[PDB]
Design a protein around this nucleic acid. Structure first.
Length: 496
RNA sequence: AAAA
């Protein structure tokens, strides 16, 4: 045989390149499988083993059950799982203090198994693989594309077994040892390993980022992946408010393992992907408001879909807050109430006020008797809608504007008892009652002014949608100015 | 009514 001749001359590098090319005859398979049993005495044999295994799994016409059983001595159950279970490739860097040029970002191919843990590399300690099996409760097969020392690959291998999809592992690497119960053990040469991983255009995850396998599974096998979007008015409060959002997120039991830096590292997110700064907004400028709304749509789209890593849109949880009540109303109209999101109200810190993860349309459910708001109405066309939930009373100027616009109707919504000091809590009942009064009394043409918390207007935007003919008037410090964007325009259609 |  051709490979038999190459094997007799120990030309493993020629065999590797011949395997990297997809030009292999079936008669060469018996000698190819036998190379997997050789001792890893030099890196050329180990790298030849890796390419052989990678070819059998990517080109399954070379994946033979008879050769798996007679050559590798695998039982029929392990041989099937090697044939049918998908493999995961995870990166991990190694630094040789004795030979700095021998350092490299290595790869590990992992296949989950049922009742057997083994490797094809002779330099690997079997007890170190048993520790991974005990920590993850998963048997596995692993092979490496390089010869190295130490146990710094254990976190990477555990990542390949816990992660459900490969995309989360395509742009990240790991380093660290794993204990028998899942706790991450520190390793050496973190700074050197980081320069190796970044030189390969990847991000390194060290024990300084992940402490146990439960925290690791929060990112690699997430149940509710929390992301952040905050709108603010001052740039100097950007980074500080991102950490305050992370603080309020960590208060939730479902997101106790959330870390801002880990979200940025695992999903290739930067600080600006999670905020929108508008220092001075001219609410009379239609085009200027359009850029802000477009930038909102682009950032939210990037957060809900990420870089294609997330496949189930229900897993993303958008922790959102805004800084301008008029701007938040339009943000909510575009956001809609089909995406799982949590709205936070900021006073001193971020306060969770509306949780749409269990019932997203709870801010839209009408009630027969109003418990949180008081309604004083005279329904005629056109209708002037006034919302009074904050400290400043807009009724006087709202009714002045009603007669300036020749509006014949009025719908005055204000807090039932107490005013400007809404108790911090589930604000979804207030929003549902405000939506009820608006939806039950809406006319052919409507105008709306509001003095309410920004989180209230944000939620109200999601409840209303873009179907209602409402003209919004923004209070420019002392006078109402018409927003040149009607609340039913086609540019406000929710794409989510 | 510009994180009320």
């Amino acid at each position: 045989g051709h490979i038999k001749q190459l094997l007799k001359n120990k030309r493993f590098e020629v065999i590797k390149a011949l395997v990297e090319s997809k030009k292999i005859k079936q008669e060469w398979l018996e000698d190819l499988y036998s190379i997997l049993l050789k001792q890893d005495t030099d890196v050329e044999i180990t790298q030849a083993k890796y390419e052989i295994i990678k070819l059998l799994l990517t080109e399954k016409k070379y994946l033979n059950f008879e050769l798996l059983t007679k050559t590798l001595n695998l039982d029929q159950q392990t041989a099937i799982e090697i044939m049918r279970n998908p493999f995961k490739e995870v990166y991990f860097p190694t630094y040789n203090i004795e030979n700095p040029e021998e350092s490299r970002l290595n790869k590990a191919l992992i296949i989950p198994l049922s009742n057997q843990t083994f490797t094809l590399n002779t330099f690997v300690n079997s007890q170190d693989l048993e520790t991974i099996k005990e920590a993850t409760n998963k048997n596995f097969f692993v092979i490496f594309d390089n010869i190295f020392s130490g146990k710094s690959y254990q976190l990477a291998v555990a990542a390949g077994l816990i992660a459900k999809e490969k995309e989360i592992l395509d742009n990240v690497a790991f380093t660290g040892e794993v204990s028998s119960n899942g706790f991450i053990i520190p390793v050496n040469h973190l700074e050197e390993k980081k320069e190796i991983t970044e030189k390969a255009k990847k991000v390194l995850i060290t024990p300084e980022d992940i402490e146990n396998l439960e925290e690791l599974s929060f990112w690699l096998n997430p149940e509710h992946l929390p992301v952040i979007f905050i709108h603010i008015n001052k740039p100097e409060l950007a980074l500080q408010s991102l950490k305050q959002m992370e603080d309020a997120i960590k208060k939730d039991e479902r997101f106790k393992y959330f870390k801002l830096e880990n979200l940025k590292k695992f999903y290739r997110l930067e600080d600006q992907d999670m905020y929108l700064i508008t220092p001075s907004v001219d609410f009379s400028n239609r085009e200027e408001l359009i850029k802000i709304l477009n930038e909102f749509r682009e950032k939210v789209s990037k957060l809900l879909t990420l870089e294609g890593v997330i496949k189930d849109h229900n897993k993303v949880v958008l922790n959102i807050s805004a800084g301008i009540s008029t701007l938040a109303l339009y943000f909510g109209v575009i956001l809609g109430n089909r995406q799982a999101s949590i709205i936070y109200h900021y006073q001193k810190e971020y306060h969770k006020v509306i949780d749409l993860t269990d019932n997203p349309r709870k801010i839209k459910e009408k009630k027969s008797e109003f418990e949180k708001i008081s309604v004083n109405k005279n329904i005629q066309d056109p209708l002037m809608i006034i919302i009074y939930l904050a400290s400043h009373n807009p009724i006087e100027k709202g009714l002045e504007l009603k007669e300036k616009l020749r509006a014949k109707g009025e719908l005055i919504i204000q807090s039932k008892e107490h005013q400007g000091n809404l108790e911090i809590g589930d604000w979804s009942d207030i929003v549902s009652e405000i939506y009820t009064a608006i939806d039950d009394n809406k006319q052919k043409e409507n105008y709306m002014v509001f003095s309410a918390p920004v989180a209230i207007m944000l939620a109200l935007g999601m409840a209303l949608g873009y179907f209602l003919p409402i003209k919004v008037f923004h209070y420019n410090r002392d006078e109402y100015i018409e927003v040149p964007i009607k609340l039913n325009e086609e540019i406000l259609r929710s794409p989510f």
